[PDB]
A paper describes a structure:
Ras proteins act as key regulators of many cellular processes by switching between inactive GDP-bound and active GTP-bound states, the latter specifically activating several downstream signalling pathways.
Interestingly, only the 3’-isomer of the nucleotide analogues was observed in the structures, consistent with results of the MS experiments comparing the efficiency of labelling of the dGTP derivative and the mixed isomers of the GTP derivative and showing a faster reaction for dGTP. However, both structures lacked the Mg2+ ions in the active site despite a Mg2+ concentration of 2 mM in the Ras solution. This tendency is presumably because of a favourable orientation of the reactive warhead and/or a reduced flexibility. Using dGTP analogues, the rate of covalent protein modification was further increased in the case of the eda derivative, indicating that the linker in the 3’-position of the ribose is superior to the 2’-position with respect to targeting [name]. Interestingly, in these experiments we also observed a drastically increased intrinsic nucleotide exchange rate for [name] compared to KRasWT in the absence of SOS (blue area), an effect that probably contributes to the increased signalling and oncogenic effect of this mutant, and also this effect is abrogated in the case of covalently locked [name]-[name].
Numbering used by the authors: 0 to 169
Amino acid sequence: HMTEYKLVVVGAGCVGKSALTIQLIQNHFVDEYDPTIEDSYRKQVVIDGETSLLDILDTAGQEEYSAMRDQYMRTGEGFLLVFAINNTKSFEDIHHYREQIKRVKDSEDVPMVLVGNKSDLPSRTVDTKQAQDLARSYGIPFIETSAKTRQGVDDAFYTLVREIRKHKEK
Ligand SMILES: *CCC(=O)NCCNC(=O)O[C@H]1[C@@H](O)[C@H](n2cnc3c(=O)[nH]c(N)nc32)O[C@@H]1COP(=O)(O)OP(=O)(O)O
């Protein structure tokens, strides 16, 4: 009567992986480094009537190559690929994170969602159509988020859960 989902958040430094996680789990945000990430790893929530235990693994603080990152990529059932819409380099890095996950899984069909975070900020440098084209080429959804206003936060994590369900049922 509960179903666990193991969700992994990946992306360049400072894109908001940890803020997205804390907003989902604690309904909390601060515009600074948030030490409550240490306390923010499981949320129990009902999604489409299913009582779901969302275990969120946040790669913040890991080196770009580490044994713990590999453990996260091996255990994760779905991945959020996060970039920030005001940081072009973080968008350019998405290719690397996608390839790294695929190479661990030996699969071309891993549940993922592309997330463009910090959508509350003006002066974006990554346009939406760029991200839509990239997500289309990967076969995965794109969702714009803000960990500050909570724009898109439930949409991003719940969409990833629904992609996992589709994957499990064929
Ligand atoms: C990261 C460098 C930096 O910003 N340094 C200044 C101190 N402030 C922060 O670190 O702020 C963090 C978040 O509050 C902020 N953030 C995250 N998501 C945001 C959003 O949707 N809208 C706005 N306005 N700010 C947002 O970004 C900083 C980094 O977030 P993080 O969550 O700690 O980043 P990673 O885990 O991805 O490293």
